[PDB]
Motif scaffolding. Structure first.
Motif, short mmCIF file in Angstrom:
data_model
loop_
_atom_site.label_atom_id
_atom_site.label_comp_id
_atom_site.label_asym_id
_atom_site.label_seq_id
_atom_site.Cartn_x
_atom_site.Cartn_y
_atom_site.Cartn_z
N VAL A 322 0.80 -1.23 0.00
CA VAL A 322 0.00 0.00 0.00
C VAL A 322 0.84 1.29 0.00
O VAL A 322 1.74 1.45 0.83
CB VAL A 322 -0.96 0.02 1.22
N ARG A 323 0.54 2.20 -0.93
CA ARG A 323 1.08 3.56 -0.89
C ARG A 323 0.35 4.35 0.18
O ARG A 323 -0.87 4.27 0.31
CB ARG A 323 0.89 4.27 -2.23
N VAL A 327 0.37 13.32 6.34
CA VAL A 327 -0.58 14.37 6.74
C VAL A 327 -0.02 15.07 7.97
O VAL A 327 -0.04 14.52 9.08
CB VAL A 327 -1.98 13.79 7.05
N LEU A 328 0.50 16.28 7.78
CA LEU A 328 1.20 17.02 8.83
C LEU A 328 0.26 17.97 9.55
O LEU A 328 -0.30 18.87 8.94
CB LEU A 328 2.37 17.82 8.24
N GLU A 329 0.08 17.76 10.85
CA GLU A 329 -0.62 18.72 11.70
C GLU A 329 0.38 19.75 12.24
O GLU A 329 1.58 19.48 12.33
CB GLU A 329 -1.37 18.02 12.84
N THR A 344 0.81 11.95 10.41
CA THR A 344 -0.08 10.79 10.34
C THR A 344 -0.26 10.45 8.86
O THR A 344 0.07 11.27 8.00
CB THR A 344 -1.41 11.05 11.11
N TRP A 345 -0.74 9.25 8.55
CA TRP A 345 -0.71 8.72 7.16
C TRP A 345 -2.09 8.36 6.59
O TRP A 345 -2.98 7.94 7.32
CB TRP A 345 0.22 7.50 7.09
N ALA A 352 -3.45 14.29 1.42
CA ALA A 352 -2.08 14.48 1.89
C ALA A 352 -1.65 15.94 1.88
O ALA A 352 -2.10 16.72 1.04
CB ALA A 352 -1.12 13.67 1.04
N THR A 353 -0.75 16.29 2.79
CA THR A 353 -0.31 17.67 2.97
C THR A 353 0.63 18.09 1.84
O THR A 353 1.56 17.36 1.49
CB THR A 353 0.39 17.86 4.33
N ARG A 354 0.36 19.27 1.28
CA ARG A 354 1.16 19.84 0.20
C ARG A 354 2.32 20.64 0.79
O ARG A 354 2.11 21.70 1.39
CB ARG A 354 0.31 20.73 -0.72
#
Length: 415
Positions: A322-323, A327-329, A344-345, A352-354
């Motif tokens: 799995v890819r 995700v950055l808080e 988190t993923w 997903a975070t840019r």
């Protein structure tokens, strides 16, 4: 010119699986001898060995205990640069449910060829038991991600004579701390003795303080920590009565801590537990070290060293088949240098975070708080004036560092 060390891990019961590491600290010892006595040096290294050695040194010889709880170290040097060698020992990983032995040290010659050591356990012990409520192995170093909930257990014995008059004991301090930043104190999760939680009985009866309290910074220096006095709260008597009926037994103090954005890579962060029954006497142990990962990129115009801002990226990871995407808080209004509070993923890449580049000269996209292993930086957009060269840059976050180098990534100018 030659010596041997036969280690004997036993806890009645021999112990297979325990790994030991030997360190030559000859020159570290003789350095202290300038300012200190043989005894003061011997202890200083034994106390805080990680101050004098890289404890996870590949070159430091390591052996595992066999069925008999026995571990040989054949053929060590007697001399080391015209000094009689002094060697330190360290249990690097321990099997369950056993505890980590004290870090013993020897100075040569004593002469004796076949030297048999018997590493006993420390009177205070500390372990990292769980990460995000999932049990880990008892080992000297754990790699962590930012936003991870780390569960620690400090274990120590109650004195046999705890309910003596002479009262004899009016203080039962338990002080944990870290000198460098990285964690914030979350919570005290249990105080167990004889496998029974006595935290409910003790709450409102101990003294208890932590890094989160306004009273901590004036009294203690340290960024992370907690202090706990059983006999220094509002009801010492009842708390002593409670402890006397478990006199001799081993108390375990469990607590959780959160890895924060001040945790940086290229920095192994340990903790230290101190137990004291008076201001005169302390028994003390250092826990396992923790480190986090990171990586630096340089987005540039192909051929030149021209830094290109506003190149958008997403970070990719494999989970077997799995890819997954980062995700950055805690990164609202950041660019280039990302210092997130929790990575988190997700399998949905649109969520997903840019990550956007800054246009700084040395390296214009940094990420900290990463676990080690393989990743892939995927370019979702080149900045205006430029086409993407290679859409994916696969790299490795090295265990506990910013990487072997900054990863250069090129963009093609359209004109």
């Amino acid at each position: 010119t030659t010596v041997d060390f036969t280690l004997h891990k036993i806890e009645r019961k021999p112990v297979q699986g325990a790994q030991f590491k030997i360190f030559n600290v000859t020159d570290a010892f003789y350095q202290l001898l300038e300012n200190h006595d043989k005894t003061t040096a011997a202890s200083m290294i034994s106390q805080n060995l990680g101050q004098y050695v890289n404890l996870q040194d590949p070159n430091a010889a390591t052996v595992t205990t066999d069925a008999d709880g026995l571990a040989a170290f054949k053929g060590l040097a007697a001399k080391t640069n015209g000094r009689h060698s002094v060697y330190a020992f360290h249990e690097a990983v321990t099997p369950q449910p056993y505890q980590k032995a004290a870090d013993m040290i020897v100075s040569l010659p004593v002469d004796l060829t076949n030297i048999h050591l018997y590493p006993k356990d420390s009177l205070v012990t500390k372990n990292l038991t769980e990460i995000n409520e999932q049990a880990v192995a008892t080992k000297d170093l754990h790699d962590v991600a930012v936003g991870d909930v780390l569960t620690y257990q400090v274990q120590f014995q109650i004195p046999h004579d705890i309910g003596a008059l002479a009262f004899k004991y009016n203080q039962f301090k338990v002080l944990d701390y870290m000198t460098k930043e990285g964690l914030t104190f979350k919570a005290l999760t249990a105080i167990t003795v004889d496998g029974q939680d006595i935290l409910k009985a003790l709450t409102g009866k101990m003294a208890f303080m932590s890094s989160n309290d306004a009273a901590w910074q004036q009294t203690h220096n340290y960024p992370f920590g907690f202090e706990l006095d059983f006999l220094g709260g509002t009801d010492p008597d009842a708390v002593r009565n409670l402890l006397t009926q478990y006199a001799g037994k081993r108390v375990t103090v469990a607590y959780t801590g959160i890895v924060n954005e001040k945790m940086i890579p290229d920095q192994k962060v340990g903790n230290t537990a101190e137990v004291s029954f008076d201001p005169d006497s302390k028994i003390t142990v250092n826990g396992p070290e923790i480190q986090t990962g990171g990586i630096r990129f340089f987005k540039h115009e192909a051929g030149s060293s021209k830094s290109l801002a506003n190149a958008t990226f997403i970070l990719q990871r494999m989970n077997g088949n799995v890819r997954e995407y980062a995700v950055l808080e805690g990164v609202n209004g950041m660019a280039g240098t990302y210092q997130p509070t929790k990575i988190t993923w997700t399998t949905n890449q649109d969520a997903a975070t840019r990550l956007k580049t800054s246009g700084a000269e040395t390296a214009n996209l940094t990420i900290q708080g990463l676990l080690p292993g393989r990743y892939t930086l995927v370019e979702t957009a080149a900045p205006e004036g430029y086409e993407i060269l290679d859409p994916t840059t696969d790299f490795e976050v090295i265990a506990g560092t910013w990487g072997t180098k900054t990863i250069r990534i090129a963009n093609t100018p359209v004109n």
